[PDB]
Design an enzyme around this catalytic site. Structure first.
Site, PDB file in Angstrom:
ATOM      1  N   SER A 187      10.826 -69.677 103.193  1.00  0.00           N
ATOM      2  CA  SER A 187      11.955 -68.770 103.401  1.00  0.00           C
ATOM      3  C   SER A 187      13.054 -69.220 102.428  1.00  0.00           C
ATOM      4  CB  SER A 187      12.486 -68.867 104.857  1.00  0.00           C
ATOM      5  OG  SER A 187      12.883 -70.155 105.186  1.00  0.00           O
ATOM      6  N   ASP A 222      17.549 -69.448 101.954  1.00  0.00           N
ATOM      7  CA  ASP A 222      18.913 -69.395 102.584  1.00  0.00           C
ATOM      8  C   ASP A 222      19.865 -68.779 101.569  1.00  0.00           C
ATOM      9  OD1 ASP A 222      17.888 -70.878 104.776  1.00  0.00           O
ATOM     10  OD2 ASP A 222      18.929 -72.662 104.244  1.00  0.00           O
ATOM     11  N   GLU A 237      27.354 -76.019 103.359  1.00  0.00           N
ATOM     12  CA  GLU A 237      26.242 -75.131 103.073  1.00  0.00           C
ATOM     13  C   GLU A 237      26.296 -74.626 101.618  1.00  0.00           C
ATOM     14  OE1 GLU A 237      23.726 -74.921 104.818  1.00  0.00           O
ATOM     15  OE2 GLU A 237      24.222 -75.043 106.928  1.00  0.00           O
ATOM     16  N   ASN A 291      13.623 -72.996 101.160  1.00  0.00           N
ATOM     17  CA  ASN A 291      13.184 -73.904 102.213  1.00  0.00           C
ATOM     18  C   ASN A 291      11.739 -74.285 102.063  1.00  0.00           C
ATOM     19  OD1 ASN A 291      15.721 -73.736 103.477  1.00  0.00           O
ATOM     20  ND2 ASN A 291      15.114 -71.741 104.288  1.00  0.00           N
ATOM     21  N   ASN A 350      19.225 -67.708 106.722  1.00  0.00           N
ATOM     22  CA  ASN A 350      17.871 -67.812 106.327  1.00  0.00           C
ATOM     23  C   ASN A 350      17.006 -66.569 106.566  1.00  0.00           C
ATOM     24  OD1 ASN A 350      16.030 -68.032 108.654  1.00  0.00           O
ATOM     25  ND2 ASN A 350      15.091 -69.102 106.902  1.00  0.00           N
ATOM     26  N   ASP A 402       9.320 -74.044 104.058  1.00  0.00           N
ATOM     27  CA  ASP A 402       8.410 -73.072 104.678  1.00  0.00           C
ATOM     28  C   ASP A 402       8.286 -71.800 103.895  1.00  0.00           C
ATOM     29  OD1 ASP A 402      10.764 -71.611 105.252  1.00  0.00           O
ATOM     30  OD2 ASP A 402      10.448 -71.551 107.374  1.00  0.00           O
TER      31      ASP A 402
END
Length: 129
Positions: free
Chosen positions: A50, A52, A35, A46, A59, A48
């Site tokens: 959002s 992280d 990650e 992301n 997220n 969409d």
């Protein structure tokens, strides 16, 4: 902060992640590796909208408030920036809530794709724990 491998394993274990919901420490180290490369300051946007945050790429769609994710919840009750601290407490606590949400570590797509089913103990080999 960029943690060392064994350094991070030790921190996660002191914060109670080792065997949390049945996931051995190696599972958590491996997730963090893919990650964030052990960097608490990692951030990634992301598709969409959002974002992280932190060592476990938590997220903003569900878990933290960043002020800029329209769908959103803040189920960890935390500003997303807390997830970028040198102190991993907020990321650990919020990860404990995520891994309890029903899908286990599958919530981390990277864990499913890169750690699940592998010899995750290798990620804590040699560490004083």
């Amino acid at each position: 902060k960029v943690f060392g491998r064994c350094e991070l394993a030790a921190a996660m274990k002191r914060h109670g992640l080792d065997n949390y919901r049945g996931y051995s420490l190696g599972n958590w180290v491996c997730a963090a590796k893919f990650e964030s490369n052990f960097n608490t300051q990692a951030t990634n946007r992301n598709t969409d909208g959002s974002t992280d945050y932190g060592i476990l790429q938590i997220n903003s769609r569900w878990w933290c408030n960043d002020g800029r994710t329209p769908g959103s919840r803040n189920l960890c009750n935390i500003p997303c920036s807390a997830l970028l601290s040198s102190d991993i407490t907020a990321s650990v606590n919020c990860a404990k809530k995520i891994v309890s949400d029903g899908n286990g570590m599958n919530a981390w797509v990277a864990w499913r794709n890169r750690c699940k089913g592998t010899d995750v103990q290798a990620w804590i080999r040699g560490c004083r724990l």
